[PDB]
Amino acid sequence: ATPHINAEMGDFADVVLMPGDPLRAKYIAETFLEDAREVNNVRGMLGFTGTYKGRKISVMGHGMGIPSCSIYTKELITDFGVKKIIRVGSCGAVLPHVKLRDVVIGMGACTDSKVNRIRFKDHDFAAIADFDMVRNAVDAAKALGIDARVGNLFSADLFYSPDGEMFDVMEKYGILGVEMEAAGIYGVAAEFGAKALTICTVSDHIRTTAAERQTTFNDMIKIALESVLLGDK
Amino acid sequence: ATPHINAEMGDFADVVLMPGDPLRAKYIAETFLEDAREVNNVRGMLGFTGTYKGRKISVMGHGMGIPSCSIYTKELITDFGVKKIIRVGSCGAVLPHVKLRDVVIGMGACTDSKVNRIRFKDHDFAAIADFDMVRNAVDAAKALGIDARVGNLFSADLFYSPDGEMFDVMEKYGILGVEMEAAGIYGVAAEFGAKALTICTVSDHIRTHEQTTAAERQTTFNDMIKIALESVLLGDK
Amino acid sequence: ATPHINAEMGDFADVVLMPGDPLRAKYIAETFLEDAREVNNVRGMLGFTGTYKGRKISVMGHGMGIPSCSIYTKELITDFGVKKIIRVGSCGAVLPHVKLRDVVIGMGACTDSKVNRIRFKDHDFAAIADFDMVRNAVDAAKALGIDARVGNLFSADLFYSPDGEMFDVMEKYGILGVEMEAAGIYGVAAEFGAKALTICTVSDHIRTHEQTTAAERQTTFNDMIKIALESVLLGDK
Amino acid sequence: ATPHINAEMGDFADVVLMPGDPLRAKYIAETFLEDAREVNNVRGMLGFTGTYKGRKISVMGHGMGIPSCSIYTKELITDFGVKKIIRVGSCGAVLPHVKLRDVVIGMGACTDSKVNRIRFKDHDFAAIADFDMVRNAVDAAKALGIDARVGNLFSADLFYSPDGEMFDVMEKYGILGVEMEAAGIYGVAAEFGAKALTICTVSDHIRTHEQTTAAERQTTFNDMIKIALESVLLGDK
Amino acid sequence: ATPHINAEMGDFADVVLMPGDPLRAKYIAETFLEDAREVNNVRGMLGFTGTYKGRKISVMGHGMGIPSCSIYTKELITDFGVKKIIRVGSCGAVLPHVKLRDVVIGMGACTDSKVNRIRFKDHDFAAIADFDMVRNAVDAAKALGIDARVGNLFSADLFYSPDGEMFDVMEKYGILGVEMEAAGIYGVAAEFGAKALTICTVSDHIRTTAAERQTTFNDMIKIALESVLLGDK
Amino acid sequence: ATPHINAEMGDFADVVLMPGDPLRAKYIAETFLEDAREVNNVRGMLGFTGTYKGRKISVMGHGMGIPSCSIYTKELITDFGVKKIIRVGSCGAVLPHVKLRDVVIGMGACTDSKVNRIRFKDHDFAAIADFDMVRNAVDAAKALGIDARVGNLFSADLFYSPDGEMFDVMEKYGILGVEMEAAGIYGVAAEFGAKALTICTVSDHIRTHEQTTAAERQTTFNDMIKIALESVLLGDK
Numbered sequence A, E: 001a002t003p004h005i006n007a008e009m010g011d012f013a014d015v016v017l018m019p020g021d022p023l024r025a026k027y028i029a030e031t032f033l034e035d036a037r038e039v040n041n042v043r044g045m046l047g048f049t050g051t052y053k054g055r056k057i058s059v060m061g062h063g064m065g066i067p068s069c070s071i072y073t074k075e076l077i078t079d080f081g082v083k084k085i086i087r088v089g090s091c092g093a094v095l096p097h098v099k100l101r102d103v104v105i106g107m108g109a110c111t112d113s114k115v116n117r118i119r120f121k122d123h124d125f126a127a128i129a130d131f132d133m134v135r136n137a138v139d140a141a142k143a144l145g146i147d148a149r150v151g152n153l154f155s156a157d158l159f160y161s162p163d164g165e166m167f168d169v170m171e172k173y174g175i176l177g178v179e180m181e182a183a184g185i186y187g188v189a190a191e192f193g194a195k196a197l198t199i200c201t202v203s204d205h206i207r208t209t210a211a212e213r214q215t216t217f218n219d220m221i222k223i224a225l226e227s228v229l230l231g232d233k
Numbered sequence B, C, D, F: 001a002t003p004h005i006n007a008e009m010g011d012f013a014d015v016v017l018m019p020g021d022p023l024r025a026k027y028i029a030e031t032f033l034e035d036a037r038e039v040n041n042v043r044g045m046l047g048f049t050g051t052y053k054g055r056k057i058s059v060m061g062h063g064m065g066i067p068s069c070s071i072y073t074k075e076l077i078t079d080f081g082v083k084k085i086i087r088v089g090s091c092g093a094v095l096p097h098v099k100l101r102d103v104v105i106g107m108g109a110c111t112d113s114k115v116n117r118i119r120f121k122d123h124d125f126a127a128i129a130d131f132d133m134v135r136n137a138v139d140a141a142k143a144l145g146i147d148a149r150v151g152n153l154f155s156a157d158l159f160y161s162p163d164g165e166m167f168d169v170m171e172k173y174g175i176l177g178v179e180m181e182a183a184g185i186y187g188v189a190a191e192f193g194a195k196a197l198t199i200c201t202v203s204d205h206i207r208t209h210e211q212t213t214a215a216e217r218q219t220t221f222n223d224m225i226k227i228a229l230e231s232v233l234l235g236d237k
């Protein structure tokens, strides 16, 4: 139905989970979803639709960077009727107190991208997530025994930045984690009138064992899934 | 004491309520506080300290604009050991569904000011409030039967803006209300490692040019203050 | 009346003196004005009208920062028929030769604010004062035996600036003093077709961190006010 | 091995063909290369290494957008000894005379991204391709009897731009096609001292709305592939 | 002594008048100066040094645009010991009340150039002239019976601007005249610690007889020359 | 006739050689052209029209800086039917390996000017030359046994830049030479739909400080002249 998504209206649920890695999308569907069916494959950007505790939910990769996720997110909302978007991924930590395996919830998202400036007449647009979604995620985490940190994330355009000094600035301002999509997703949601949220796991420290990482990653997914159920009520 | 605050460490509580109008600060201290005492009068920016249900609380005006509030908030944090700041004021609505007397909670705050760019290497700094403070405010409101709206606020530098088209963009992006301090307070809090939040009551409709009434104002004003105060107690738990 | 000024057309003279501190406005009206009367108290921003040597003059505080002063200046011009605005305040010195208690006249005003960019299509708008007003001020000072310095001022948005290197640049470019309103007032005057000027007294040295004394302040303050008042008379000729 | 590439030094040839679609790389490898082998699959970003007319060559997808392609190109240059990068993608046409399926050579690349400004002290960095590479491609097209336009491309960050008027500006300036990565690739090449070039096939008209299908873009653009391949051989001689 | 000025220290007076047209520089020297000697010719940018009422003064063209005048001005101050610079030229009017042949004095200068931003950390630098020089010029004019307008000038980078809307903005903000060098000259003076001033004659209206124009032009020059004498005392 | 050119339609050839120095144009005309005639003298900006190997060609100075050359190039294109513009100037080298007297071909041009941003909605406009013209020049140099580097140039607004660190950035990005007009010329050509190209002779080293003399730059750079002239003939064939 779209140049980037070879699917039809109704193929996706009203809620969609989005990891950056398409392979991760498949992983999620196979692990947590029941009766998951492949719903998209153009450009290898795998998309699936299944059920979670009797609840219809979709999962689809978003690619790396603001421009990539911006395409997918907009299309989903606009052409597939998606109402809520939850980005599940990884991030780099700058804060000394922020440890590996920590779960971070992006209430807001700083960025070095020019996308929001283009949309906001060159002014300062505060890219924020949906309040309810944030609280639902916090509660869900709490129920699982996880203590998620809520704050600002930094969506970078350059993974390999020439400005190392920027990290000091981020630290000074309390940035929780460093990723590359949050701000873009928040911008699209506000622009198209949808609800978004971004959850990440500290994959590394800008300043563990395999089995350990994976456990936390799964925990993050569960938090996301559970938060959706909470929101339904 | 500081260049703008004629007080000493300990004169202020760990949390302070800040209205824009100094006159409102006196009203609050007299109406909701117990055993209140004046702690500042420099430049007529009245400040008081008292208790609310046994809890120590401070109240002081911040003036109009980011630059003004930035001065007070900074001093409070650095020289008075203030941990939480709650701004209570009015705002203009742009959203059709946003009605007068409505209560708005600024989870975030957009702005046309250059303050955050100066701080953030010219990048986009998302001026946000403390999550817990937001949650607490929402709960307190609910407990009082009030339906507060949580979203983005727009902190303007120019009350009398030469660019009216900006209002359309604001509406477009779902901004809840327009005021002139939020973004500055959030920037200061982040810079100094403090917690802040701004609650506003819809004073008028930027669109359908329709102002509220003194009566409605007074009442809604009281509610907002109740919400803020109660929210503090919740945060203490 | 206006949202910020509880007065009616005619309550204010064609020219108004504006200090930042409302308390200073009262002092001026009581000390230099004759048959003065209060015309505003909203938000504690005291305003008065009286005469000086038979000449009708008004005095009112403007608060701190560009956004604050922008509101008052705009209202005065548009709703009160004010033709000339004279800001009288303090400033910080960056220039080694610029000594404390020194009188500075802002012919122009640099700034880190975004207000003029919003007005000027993002280009460089030179915020300047009225030439005649500058000349008059210089003459009045001379007549009083005071040696006023005429140059550029720097209107800052952040009193507590995170970028200290900016001071070196200021020094480099010969800026006379740093305050927080000039650029905003000049922008408003140009936008509404009014005349403005800002006179400041060196309160402290940004560099050799050295503040003035209450005594020296009071005296120098009086001189500045004398200069401003006398300058008005000259302009009337 | 790198964080985004599960390969080792030697797996990649000195020159790499890069389409945005990993599926297109697979197609290229299986249809144009000889004895091609999969050298990368991380994130599904297929990468292959085969032979073309005796010449060792690689093919790998770069994803959509400047931030995506920036990562891959950098790693290739720094950890795989890649010296030349040839992007082979699609683009939207703005010019009336620019018909579909047309082949455009990006000698230069405009952009709305902030990446180059970050590297260039906020100045204007002209993102250009390697001259030799451009010429090689021009001659190759000539030899294949294929018409190819050489000019400026526009690397957009927003496929779904809110600024429609921008298209009129692009048209006025003669931009040949609108894509999403050229400028980023050119910036990386200059930063890491490598040679790059971008070739595109008009896959749609922003004006008319004559977009092609996915399957199309995925396996239909052979012409541009030939040019790229042939251009490499020329560079060798 | 310099790549743009083939002269030696002492060849120029401490004060120099600068028109945009080199041919105009020659014209000034021949008309108002006594014993004027050619002091520079590289690039055809004529420079002369003579006397005016027994006062040593120089005259040299500056070229069109901020970048051109910036070179000349800096060199003069830095390598020739010049202390005061007076630009004498023409400008376009935007204000309805601003008539042709009117004499405008640039107390300040707005601009669309990025030069001052580069110098001022991207902030707003108010490019202004020297106060004394302004007053001296005002007085001089008054003595000649001319009523000069004192205000803001607009130094444009693009003579042939693609932004016609800018003219409305200028008008709204009270811009007196439109030229292309003032801001640049003011920037250099502040940077190198010198004194500058710009005087112009409304050559045209963005909204007369030859003999008329010329008379006013001469008047402007006289004002400039006289203002210098005033400053000497 | 135009406001800056005292000539008439027909006085100029379809292609024009433009040096910054009017004196250099005179030199070119008298040393390389046949039966050359002065077609312009306004402002001393000498312009001539002669013949080269039977080919009608013009030569005219453009002055120093983007704003200067912008005026001349525009008028030429719009009122004199000029189709091709070849700038022949000097430049300062930043690269260590870039020796003096070297000939550089500006395929692209970076800049610190705000002109292109004004035309390009504040985005990044890649100022590039005409491909054919570049190739023609490359072949011409080859035929004359002259070595010529093709790459990016940097069009500066400030010859005497306050930002010395900018040179390190230029060096890192491989800029071939620093001049003051290429980017402006390229912008005009695109705006008015004309073809342009800039060739330069290294007249000094920003690093070493090996600058040449005025007389030099004025009549010594023959090599670049030949290339330009010869390149025109190629374009004809």
Ligand SMILES: O=c1[nH]cnc2c([C@@H]3O[C@H](CO)[C@@H](O)[C@H]3O)n[nH]c12
Pocket (backbone or CB within 6 Å): A020, A063, A064, A065, A089, A090, A091, A092, A093, A156, A159, A178, A179, A180, A181, A203, A204, D003
């Ligand atoms: O330390 C980090 N920095 C930047 N991005 C990331 C990411 C995420 O992983 C991808 C980069 O490999 C991006 O999609 C980004 O969102 N994880 N960890 C980091």
Ligand SMILES: O=c1[nH]cnc2c([C@@H]3O[C@H](CO)[C@@H](O)[C@H]3O)n[nH]c12
Pocket (backbone or CB within 6 Å): B020, B063, B064, B065, B089, B090, B091, B092, B093, B156, B159, B178, B179, B180, B181, B203, B204, B206, C003
């Ligand atoms: O419609 C509005 N626009 C902008 N600011 C405000 C405000 C608030 O009131 C003051 C100005 O009236 C500012 O301090 C601001 O916080 N109320 N209503 C509005």
Ligand SMILES: O=c1[nH]cnc2c([C@@H]3O[C@H](CO)[C@@H](O)[C@H]3O)n[nH]c12
Pocket (backbone or CB within 6 Å): B003, C020, C063, C064, C065, C089, C090, C091, C092, C093, C156, C159, C178, C179, C180, C181, C203, C204, C206
């Ligand atoms: O050193 C200084 N810096 C910035 N502003 C000021 C000011 C003035 O005083 C107030 C803040 O103290 C502002 O209103 C400003 O106008 N005085 N001294 C300084």
Ligand SMILES: O=c1[nH]cnc2c([C@@H]3O[C@H](CO)[C@@H](O)[C@H]3O)n[nH]c12
Pocket (backbone or CB within 6 Å): A003, D020, D063, D064, D065, D089, D090, D091, D092, D093, D156, D159, D178, D179, D180, D181, D203, D204, D206
């Ligand atoms: O009309 C268009 N506009 C913008 N980008 C593209 C693209 C290219 O294809 C992908 C988006 O579909 C991006 O990688 C981009 O480079 N194709 N067609 C268009």
Ligand SMILES: O=c1[nH]cnc2c([C@@H]3O[C@H](CO)[C@@H](O)[C@H]3O)n[nH]c12
Pocket (backbone or CB within 6 Å): E020, E063, E064, E065, E089, E090, E091, E092, E093, E156, E159, E178, E179, E180, E181, E203, E204, F003
């Ligand atoms: O109407 C006008 N617009 C822009 N510049 C000028 C000028 C001056 O003349 C030259 C443009 O021809 C520039 O050097 C500029 O300073 N005169 N009249 C005008």
Ligand SMILES: O=c1[nH]cnc2c([C@@H]3O[C@H](CO)[C@@H](O)[C@H]3O)n[nH]c12
Pocket (backbone or CB within 6 Å): E003, F020, F063, F064, F065, F089, F090, F091, F092, F093, F156, F159, F178, F179, F180, F181, F203, F204, F206
């Ligand atoms: O080292 C240099 N830097 C900057 N511009 C130039 C120039 C050129 O020569 C003139 C300045 O001398 C300008 O027209 C400019 O293009 N030559 N050498 C240099």
